[PDB]
A paper describes a structure:
A screen of additives identified hexatungstotellurate to contribute to larger, better-ordered crystals, as has previously been reviewed. These crystals belonged to space group P2, with six copies of Ck ZnuA in the asymmetric unit. With a formal charge of minus six, TEW often interacts electrostatically with positively charged residues and through hydrogen bonding in protein structures. Each TEW in the Ck ZnuA structure is in close proximity to Lys91 of four symmetry-related protein chains. All residues could be modeled into the electron density with the exception of the His-rich loop, which is typical of cluster A-I SBP structures, where this region is disordered. In all six chains zinc is bound between the domains and is coordinated by Glu59, His60, His147 and His211.
In bacteria, high-affinity zinc import is accomplished by ATP-binding cassette (ABC) transporters, which rely on extracellular solute-binding proteins (SBPs) to acquire the metal and deliver it to the membrane permease. By this classification, SBPs that bind zinc, manganese or iron belong to cluster A-I, which is defined by two related α/β domains linked by a long α-helix. The ZnuA proteins of Gram-negative species primarily belong to group II, which is defined by zinc specificity, the presence of a long flexible loop rich in His and Asp/Glu residues, and metal coordination by three His residues and one Glu residue or water in a tetrahedral geometry. Here, we characterize zinc binding to the cluster A-I SBP ZnuA from the human pathogen Citrobacter koseri (Ck ZnuA) and present the crystal structure of the holo form.
Residue numbers in the entry: 27 to 118, 143 to 313
Write the structure that this text describes.
């Protein structure tokens, strides 16, 4: 099997290795990328994976550990890829929420495909063809999203937790800023003040919760005000692995942003 660390890395691998081997996500639905640690049975899945896909040690900390035993032909480490490295952003030490960069996704699909062809050479036929389709969906989605999000350029909003840099920069969104960075921090207390003042001084159209964290803090700093409220799910927790899953992720996310920000 192809064992992906996070669900949207699954979405990608599931497209490339469709019909060739199954894909498996380690980080379960509704857990957060910051704050997991590998089950014994999750390490089994890694030890006997055909191919392992993850970002890199600055992101999925919890699995740097087990990935040192795995050799280079049996894994794809997306933060240290040829075409990705050059376009890593800074953390306002780089932002690693890469799985939302279509350019990076592309580069990842490529590298996955390469390694699978190597390991499973009698499936080259299908693999080559799965990839072609991916590149096509992905391209055609990047177009539709672009259009959907284009009218939200300018509209300022706030997000819980800083995950969306890559996506936001690429489609030209206009975030006023984030509540946290690591969302195991609260954050309080001045942070929450600076947001409040910004929201009541008109200035912001939407504020965005997340499903893997209590919206609790976001209602508040908003109640009373003319700010609308929504949610963003950066792990597409409610999307099934499949060919068209990663293109669905981006569309969903676009719709999440837009469903609140439209006007």
């Amino acid at each position: 099997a192809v064992v992906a660390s996070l669900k949207p890395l699954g979405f990608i691998a599931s497209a490339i290795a469709d019909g060739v081997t199954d894909t498996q996500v380690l980080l379960p639905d509704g857990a957060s990328e910051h704050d997991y640690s590998l089950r014994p049975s999750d390490v089994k899945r890694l030890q006997g994976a055909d191919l392992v896909v993850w970002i890199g040690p600055e992101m999925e900390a919890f699995m740097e550990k087990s990935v040192k035993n795995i050799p280079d032909g049996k894994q794809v480490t997306i933060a240290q890829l040829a075409d990705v490295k050059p376009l890593l952003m800074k953390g306002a030490d780089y932002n690693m929420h890469l799985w939302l960069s279509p350019e990076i996704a592309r580069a990842s699909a490529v590298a996955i495909h390469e390694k699978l062809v190597e390991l499973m050479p009698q499936s080259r036929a299908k693999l080559d063809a799965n990839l072609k389709d991916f590149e096509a969906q992905l391209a055609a989605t990047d177009k539709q999203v672009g259009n959907e999000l284009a009218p939200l350029k300018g509209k300022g909003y706030f997000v819980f937790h800083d995950a969306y840099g890559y996506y936001e920069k690429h489609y030209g969104l206009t975030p006023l800023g984030h509540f946290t960075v690591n969302p195991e921090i609260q954050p309080g207390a001045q942070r929450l003040h600076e947001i409040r003042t910004q929201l009541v001084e008109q200035k912001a159209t939407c504020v965005f919760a997340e499903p893997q964290f209590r919206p609790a803090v976001v209602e508040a700093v908003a109640r009373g005000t003319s700010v609308r409220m929504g949610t963003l799910d950066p792990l597409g927790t409610n999307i099934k692995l499949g060919k068209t899953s990663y293109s669905a992720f981006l569309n969903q996310l676009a719709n999440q942003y837009a469903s609140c920000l439209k006007g």
